[PDB]
Design an enzyme around this catalytic site. Structure first.
Site, mmCIF file in Angstrom:
data_model
loop_
_atom_site.group_PDB
_atom_site.id
_atom_site.type_symbol
_atom_site.label_atom_id
_atom_site.label_comp_id
_atom_site.label_asym_id
_atom_site.label_seq_id
_atom_site.Cartn_x
_atom_site.Cartn_y
_atom_site.Cartn_z
ATOM 1 N N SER A 43 0.825 -1.205 0.000
ATOM 2 C CA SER A 43 0.000 0.000 0.000
ATOM 3 C C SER A 43 0.859 1.253 0.000
ATOM 4 C CB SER A 43 -0.936 0.004 1.210
ATOM 5 O OG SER A 43 -1.802 1.126 1.181
ATOM 6 N N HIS A 69 -8.339 2.389 0.560
ATOM 7 C CA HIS A 69 -8.527 1.842 -0.779
ATOM 8 C C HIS A 69 -10.000 1.738 -1.158
ATOM 9 C CE1 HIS A 69 -4.300 1.153 -0.630
ATOM 10 N NE2 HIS A 69 -4.379 0.159 0.236
#
Ligand SMILES: [Mg+2]
Ligand SMILES: [Mg+2]
Length: 326
Positions: free
Chosen positions: A98, A215
């Site tokens: 990430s 996300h």
RNA sequence: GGACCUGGCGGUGCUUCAUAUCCCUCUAGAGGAGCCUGUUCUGUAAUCGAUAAACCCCGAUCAACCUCACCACCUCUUGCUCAGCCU
């Protein structure tokens, strides 16, 4: 064309790998103290002290964990270069989960430490702001062959539609290995999923200790700040094949990293597809060496689930201690 | 009118068994996940179509600002070589 087994693939971790004691076993190695000094210069606080010894509650806060992971990952790359120069010399791919993506680019010569760290800081702060904006969260779920994920998301939205909230969010957020996903959105949806696991055929269910729904579209407010932060930065051509988290393929030209790095902020992480893209091959073909440069061993477990034969040649760079005092 | 003969049904069903291939039983593995292909519907002016012709320099690979293909506008002309196209 080197035989698979001489080349190496570097995997950079992301959110959730923070641990107290991070950095010890890397300081005495070359060029790491200067990296933490630059981290001080850019951030405005002493990352070194927080990573080495901290309450773990400050370290679990979003504004602090991501820069810590980024800096620790690059320090681990330095240590790996010191121990095994050939491993760094023969590198074919790179990938981060990430926030580790920002590390991978910096390792690939597409960005610099200062600009990358500033971008990571802005990203973390903006995400935290969006997290306070609306309550949200993340839930890791392991399913069975009879499990329906989109379906479970639909009723997870039906419940809180009956409760009544504007365009409720509950969507699969991380594809990490077969039948194991992470769903993101409002607490009531994930609560509903926990208690309807048996109906939805979920073997295990575990709330991720994160601030908000990463996300997903809930982090839309955090897109514009980070967006600005990337305009001043001049990204170059990555030297090694760096793989993206939006669509799980190599970054091909530098003119698209700017927008993919912002789309990742509100797009599911395609980790399983990245592993398939890097390691899938015919039976009997050899696999490259794999090094998890950074804290933890989560990506090792995910690789074990994704591809056992690739995992056989996996190793992790230890960031909590060192065998020999250099 | 009387006696006799051939027949033909490209015919019809059943009976018993040889009844091996084929069965049925019996034995051992093959559905979830991620990508790629086939068909359908919907949609576009148009092709999410191809690399003895890109990229990569682990394997493979997606779109690549390669290039060909498609769509909408234009330009060139005796030109390359009495040219040029894998039509
Ligand atoms: Mg096309
Ligand atoms: Mg032609």
């Amino acid at each position: 064309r080197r035989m698979p087994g001489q080349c190496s693939v570097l995997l950079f971790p992301g959110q959730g790998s923070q641990v107290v004691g991070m950095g010890r076993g890397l300081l005495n190695y070359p060029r790491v103290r200067e990296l933490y000094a630059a981290a001080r210069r850019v951030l405005g606080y002493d990352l070194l002290e927080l990573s080495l010894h901290g309450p773990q509650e400050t370290l679990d806060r979003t504004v602090h964990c991501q820069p810590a992971i980024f800096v620790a990952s690059l320090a681990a790359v330095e240590k790996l270069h010191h121990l095994q120069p050939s491993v760094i010399e023969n590198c074919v791919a790179a990938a981060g989960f990430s926030v580790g993506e920002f590390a991978a680019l910096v390792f690939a010569g597409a960005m610099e430490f200062a600009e990358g760290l500033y971008a990571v800081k802005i990203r973390a702060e903006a995400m935290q702001e969006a997290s306070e904006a609306v309550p949200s969260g993340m839930l890791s779920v392991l399913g069975q062959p009879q499990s329906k994920f989109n379906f479970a998301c639909l009723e997870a939205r039906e419940h809180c539609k009956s409760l009544g909230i504007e365009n409720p969010v509950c969507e699969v957020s991380n594809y990490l290995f077969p039948d194991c996903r992470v769903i993101s959105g409002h607490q009531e949806a994930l609560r509903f999923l926990q208690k309807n696991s048996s109906k939805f055929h979920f073997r295990r269910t575990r709330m991720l200790p994160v601030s908000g729904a990463f996300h997903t579209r809930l982090m839309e407010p955090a897109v514009e700040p980070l967006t600005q932060a990337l305009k001043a930065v001049d990204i170059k051509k990555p030297l090694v094949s760096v793989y993206s988290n939006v669509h799980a393929h190599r970054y091909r030209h530098p003119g698209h990293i700017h927008k993919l790095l912002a789309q990742q902020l509100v797009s599911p992480v395609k980790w399983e597809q990245t592993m398939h893209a890097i390691y899938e091959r015919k039976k009997g073909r050899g696999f490259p060496q794999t090094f998890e440069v950074g804290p933890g061993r989560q990506l090792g477990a995910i690789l074990k689930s994704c591809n056992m034969q690739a995992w056989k040649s996996y190793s992790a760079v230890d960031v909590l201690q060192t065998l020999e005092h250099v």
